[PDB]
Amino acid sequence: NLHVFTIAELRAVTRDFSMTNFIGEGGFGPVYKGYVHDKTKPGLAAQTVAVKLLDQTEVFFLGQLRHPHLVKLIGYCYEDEHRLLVYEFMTRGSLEKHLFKKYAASLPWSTRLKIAIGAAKGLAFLHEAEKPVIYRDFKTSNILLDSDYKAKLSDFGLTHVAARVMGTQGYAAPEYIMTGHLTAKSDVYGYGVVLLELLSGRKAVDKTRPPREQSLVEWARPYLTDARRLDRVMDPSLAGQYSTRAAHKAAAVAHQCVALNPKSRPHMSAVVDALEPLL
Ligand SMILES: Nc1ncnc2c1ncn2[C@@H]1O[C@H](COP(=O)(O)OP(=O)(O)O)[C@@H](O)[C@H]1O
């Protein structure tokens, strides 16, 4: 379930938190990769791990949130002032590092659909949990990928107008930005943006695009209902791998998730139901 580590154990796991194992500064603190051997913890198989240094009832609750499309929380360390979390390591890292490549040759249409479906299943599970788990803003980088490009959600369960909107890159739900109201439907909005990114291969907000195209959502929304002009939106790298019907339906799923009205947005289980026939 959840293992307890000491700092000394996590030093052995991470080579004393060597900068060679530094993975990046995350939303909640620095992240290091590590390796647990078969003998490190009884009942835990040898595997690569991510160790997060955070800059608890909640952590025990996070250890009960088990699902094939959530990153596994393996354990934790609370020692001195320090709070560390130990996660399964996602071999291919976050979706944003693959999706916005110029060519993204390892992400053909069916792999993108598989990623959209797994992310939707993870979010549906979180939304249907004993306590609703909702993100502050569901973004591309909350989707991590294993070696088979299986999607697993990360950082799950972990104001005034200016502070809500400052530094957002297009994933925060409209109603959260303007009123601060956060519900499961706010995640669905961000999921819809990521789905548009998967269909187009373009970042939600790109300042280097022409001003009419800088916001993916505003630019794409009028074409999502136009089946003959949907190819303006679709990733040119995907040409030939989808039918017009398949692209139109996935675009309609995205269209519904990015509705400005939260009441129009689907439940994530309905998104799963809509996308699986495409695969
Ligand atoms: N479980 C994990 N497996 C692999 N890489 C991870 C894991 N958790 C976080 N990372 C990576 O660590 C870095 C910072 O952590 P995170 O907060 O998830 O990313 P970001 O900085 O994009 O918000 C990112 O490169 C992210 O992909």
Author numbering: 4 to 58, 69 to 171, 181 to 301
Quote what the paper states about this structure.
We identified ScRIPK, a member of the RLCK VII subfamily, by a screen for sugarcane orthologs of Arabidopsis RIPK and rice GUDK. Thus, ScRIPK is a member of the RLCK VII subfamily localized in the plasma membrane. Furthermore, bacterial growth was measured to determine the bacterial proliferation inside plants, showing that transgenic plants exhibited significantly higher bacterial proliferation than that in wild-type plants at 3 days. These results suggest that ScRIPK plays role in regulating drought tolerance and disease defense in Arabidopsis. Like the typical structure of protein kinases, ScRIPK-KD contains a small N-lobe, composed of five β-sheets and an α-helix, and a large C-lobe, composed of six helices, an activation loop, and a catalytic loop.
We also analyzed the ScRIPK-KD activation loopresidues that mediated the kinase functions. This activation loop contains three phosphorylation sites, namely, T250, S253, and T254, as indicated by the electron density.
